[PDB]
């Protein structure tokens, strides 16, 4: 996603994600969400394994 390389499962999420915010992060400063550039939908990332 716009250079945000990573491995995991993308799932539709309920995160509010105010319009200016684009990435979203957890306490460990690891991106656990993204905004899809085509459609402005929030997909949280749950790692596999």
């Amino acid at each position: 996603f716009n250079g945000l390389t990573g491995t995991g499962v993308l799932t539709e999420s309920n995160k509010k994600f105010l319009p200016f915010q684009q990435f979203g992060r957890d306490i460990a400063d690891t991106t656990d969400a993204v905004r899809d550039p085509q459609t402005l939908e929030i997909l949280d990332i749950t790692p596999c394994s």
């Binding site: 509010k16 105010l18 915010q21 979203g24 992060r25």
Partner: protein
Amino acid sequence: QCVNLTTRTQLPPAYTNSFTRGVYYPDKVFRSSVLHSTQDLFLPFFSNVTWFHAIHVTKRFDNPVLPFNDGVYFASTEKSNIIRGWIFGTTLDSKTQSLLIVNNATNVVIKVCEFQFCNDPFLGVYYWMESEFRVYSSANNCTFEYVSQPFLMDLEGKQGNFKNLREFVFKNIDGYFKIYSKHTPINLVRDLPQGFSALEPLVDLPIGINITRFQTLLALHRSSSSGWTAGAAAYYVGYLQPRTFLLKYNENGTITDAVDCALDPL
């Protein structure tokens, strides 16, 4: 045209306290139910800010050119379309670059395009259509012009007693140029109220100018050098400083409150 509108009765020095205001969103990242510490150019809590009054109750056209330092907090909590834009330039006399920002409630004309500013550049609507447009003499060299207009960032339409609490933050760090902005309805009389407010980097424009000094463009009412009106202005200037702030994010991803880790031992 460019007129020598003097109306200069030097106002006495005015100083007020900024309280817990002037704090913006550091990055475009959604954080929920966490506290984040960020080192950036913020307005120190309970700092001293300058309150120019461009009122006519006391005819004062308060348009001084003040330094930029590290960034400008501008709480233009005025009435309908009084202060419109801002000029950011080291010399602002067409010798060097001087980026001009004008909204005029309809468009957005951010242009580096070093202009020949004659004395005091200002806007104005004639007794109504906007008429005073000669803030300069010539465009000289017109660099990156940003001919796109997002929307009228002033967001006028509210009336009362300084009801439209409008706040802007101008930042120029190395490259780029950030303009954060928040609007809040408050009554009070003229001062900055209590509470916390911050909402998005309104407009980010990559310019890279020296931006050493700055000033503001003031709209007026043609009935001319003395026959005008000022309404009620709230010219507010605060200089940012590099501080560390501990911002708090609630569960729906908005900054609720923050602290400045340089004010008091607590």
